[PDB]
Amino acid sequence: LQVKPCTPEFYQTHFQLAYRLQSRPRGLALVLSNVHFTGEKELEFRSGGDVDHSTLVTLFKLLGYDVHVLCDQTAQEMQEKLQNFAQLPAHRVTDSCIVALLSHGVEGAIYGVDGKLLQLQEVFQLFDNANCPSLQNKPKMFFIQACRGDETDRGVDQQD
Amino acid sequence: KMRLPTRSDMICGYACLKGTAAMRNTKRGSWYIEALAQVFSERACDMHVADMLVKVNALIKDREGYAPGTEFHRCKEMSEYCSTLCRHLYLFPGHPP
């Protein structure tokens, strides 16, 4: 994994149309991976979740982020530590934010390791303009590696 | 003095669509995270995040399941992104030095 730098010429021709993105660090990034599940509802151990986690930790570091990490968290742990994260005062001196959540899920919610669901609307709200004044008008990126259903897409042949 | 909507300036990338599953390779990781790292790492220099997520969509659209003797063999997936962004999101990797 290598991140090719943008040229000064690119910056000078694009900075005025874009969100301000020059702080050091570019922002705080949180990578939250659940891989091993232990609740009453059985959920299949997410093999390869470890490569996902390395990949994103490396990627966001290379993109200039201060990367925080959480592994194998319960729904409650997830809600509480997402809230702590959104409330960190470091967000005042950065220009953007990144949250990556990697787990099993259902439509509109992700599982913690205990098989309980954290609703995604509730997560986005932690970082909104009401609740996270520090990030007002700053770009906030979310990436959700999780299922939203249990049906296989067998796909469709290309017509003609 | 102007006010903000409750929520704005967010972009959220999803590995799959509402009602659909996401697919994960047991050795290579998730299709989406794999696709995302490749594109972001190559194109952060000259492409904004929303456009980069379109390219991730392109890779995902074309990928298919390898898992012979399961219903997941030759299975598909489609990622998507939703945005309340109000300008370009350039990450400007490496600038200034």
Binding site: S47 | A22, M23, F72
Partner: peptide, 5 residues
């Protein structure tokens, strides 16, 4: 192999 998520 590929599996569901």
């Amino acid at each position: 192999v590929d599996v569901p998520x």
